[PDB]
């Protein structure tokens, strides 16, 4: 929530977690320099300059800058995120897995296993697909001299990317295990915030050459600060429903006399889901570079262009609202109230309580979702007005940064509170 930064670094117990996290991130960023055998990187970096390669930006941002360097983790954890989304879909469709999920955690572990396997298999599939379409349909426009666009190159790429996404997934799990915050979350966060410093540096370097107006950059940075303060102030906002109970032997309370309900859960999962969703058509249309129509429908979902930004905003709002609504279960709070003798002044403990809870939550979460949609919309507009242009400073990027930071800090502080009392 707030602070808990110095005390977390003083305590050796959390210091080990932090240093371990930094170590794994170091190994990640080091492994980000090991290129896929048989791939010309300079021509890719040169391809990402044109309008035909600009659409890759949204995909490049969530790769951790691995795409342009085509590392072993070329696609990042995004195949695993896509695998998780598809896993949600398949879970919804066929109840053969939901029965196992209803058989306890013993089925949940199965769901997890199949999710990960789906991730690795997606690594293989997407690797082979990119290698077949994007890398050698031109062909050989991105291939190193001495490398043929045959079965051998495809084999090498597949073998590389499979073990790549495998090792990366394992790393994420180890971060989730022996480190602060969520693994995949901190990894995506890292992959985004890595590019931040060179952007600022090159911008400052562009200021003195009379290329970029200093006022534009200053106003831009100020807008970043305002975004920070804004999301920080919204995430901590809450509605407090007073509950009085219970004079007699039923109580007495004795406990918290109010139920807090917030606009944000908060969760970094929604906008990541929406990110992958927005990336799928772009990732499926971009490899077929020579085809104009597919390039058109790919530019239709570009987060920079009005259309793609619109779709992105809708996705952010929708996913935020849905996730926030799902995470908060009225049933458990209500039965807790009934069992503890909790009585909210005005109604009777039971179904009408959850009905009223839904009645407030539904009217409440809307403004939060719309707010996150606003944070999704505004930065691209500012960039379109100001001189600065960077997808690393886009709406969804700021959403991810703020989200992950807040999540990690909140969790750590929560653990401190738990060890306290």
């Amino acid at each position: 929530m707030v602070k808990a930064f110095w005390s977390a670094l003083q305590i050796p117990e959390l210091r080990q977690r932090v240093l371990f996290t930094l170590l794994v991130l170091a190994a990640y960023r080091l492994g980000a320099f090991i290129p896929t055998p048989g791939v010309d990187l300079d021509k890719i970096q040169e391809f990402l300059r044109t309008a035909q390669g600009g659409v890759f930006g949204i995909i490049n941002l969530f790769s951790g800058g691995n795409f342009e360097r085509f590392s072993i983790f070329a696609l990042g954890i995004m195949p695993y995120i896509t695998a998780a989304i598809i896993m949600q879909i398949l879970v919804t469709v066929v109840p053969a897995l939901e029965k196992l999920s209803k058989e306890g955690e013993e089925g949940r572990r199965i769901i997890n296993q199949y999710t990960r396997i789906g991730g690795i298999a997606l690594g293989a599939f997407q690797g082979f697909f990119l290698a077949t379409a994007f890398l050698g349909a031109e062909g050989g426009r991105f291939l190193l001299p001495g490398w043929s666009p045959g079965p051998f190159f495809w084999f090498v790429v597949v073998v590389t990317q499979v073990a790549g996404i495998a090792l990366l997934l394992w790393m994420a799990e180890r971060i989730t295990e022996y480190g602060i915050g969520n693994g995949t979350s901190l990894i995506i966060f890292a992959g985004i915030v890595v590019e931040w410093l060179p952007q600022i540096l090159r911008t400052i370097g562009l200021i003195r050459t009379g290329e970029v107006n200093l006022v534009a950059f200053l106003f831009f940075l100020a807008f970043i600060v305002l975004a920070f303060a804004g999301m920080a102030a919204v995430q901590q906002a809450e509605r407090r429903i007073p509950v009085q109970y219970a004079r007699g032997a039923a109580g007495y309370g004795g406990q918290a006399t109010y139920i807090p309900i917030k606009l944000n859960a908060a969760g970094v999962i929604p906008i990541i889901f929406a990110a992958a969703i927005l990336q799928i058509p772009i990732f499926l249309a971009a490899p077929f570079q020579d085809n104009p129509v597919l390039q058109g429908i790919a530019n239709f979902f570009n987060p920079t262009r009005p259309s793609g930004l619109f779709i992105e905003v809708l996705l952010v709002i929708l996913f935020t609202y849905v996730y926030t609504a799902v995470q908060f279960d009225p049933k458990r709070i209500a039965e807790s109230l009934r069992e503890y003798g909790g009585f909210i002044p005005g109604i009777r403990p039971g179904e009408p309580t959850v009905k009223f809870l839904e009645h407030i939550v539904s009217r409440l979460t809307l403004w939060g979702a719309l707010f996150l949609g606003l944070v999704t919309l505004l930065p691209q507009i500012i960039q379109n007005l100001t001189g600065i242009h960077s997808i690393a400073f886009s709406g969804i990027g700021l959403l991810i940064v703020v989200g992950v930071a807040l999540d990690t800090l909140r969790q750590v502080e929560s653990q401190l509170m738990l060890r306290s009392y």
Partner: protein, 60 residues
């Protein structure tokens, strides 16, 4: 705004008026916390990819 069901947006405003917003100190501390976190990881990762690039640069 359209027929025939009435705008429940008023409720969405009403239940927004009964919302307790965080204090000044909470906003300041939150902002400074996010800033500290982000700045820290940005500097550390920056140094990371920098020295990694400069180390790989020796392999030619």
């Amino acid at each position: 705004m359209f027929a025939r069901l009435i705008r429940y947006f008023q409720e969405a405003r009403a239940e927004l008026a009964r919302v307790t917003w965080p204090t000044r100190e909470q906003v300041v501390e939150g902002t400074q916390a996010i800033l500290l976190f982000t700045l820290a990881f940005m500097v550390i990762l920056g140094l990371y990819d920098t020295v990694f690039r400069f180390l790989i640069g020796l392999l030619r």
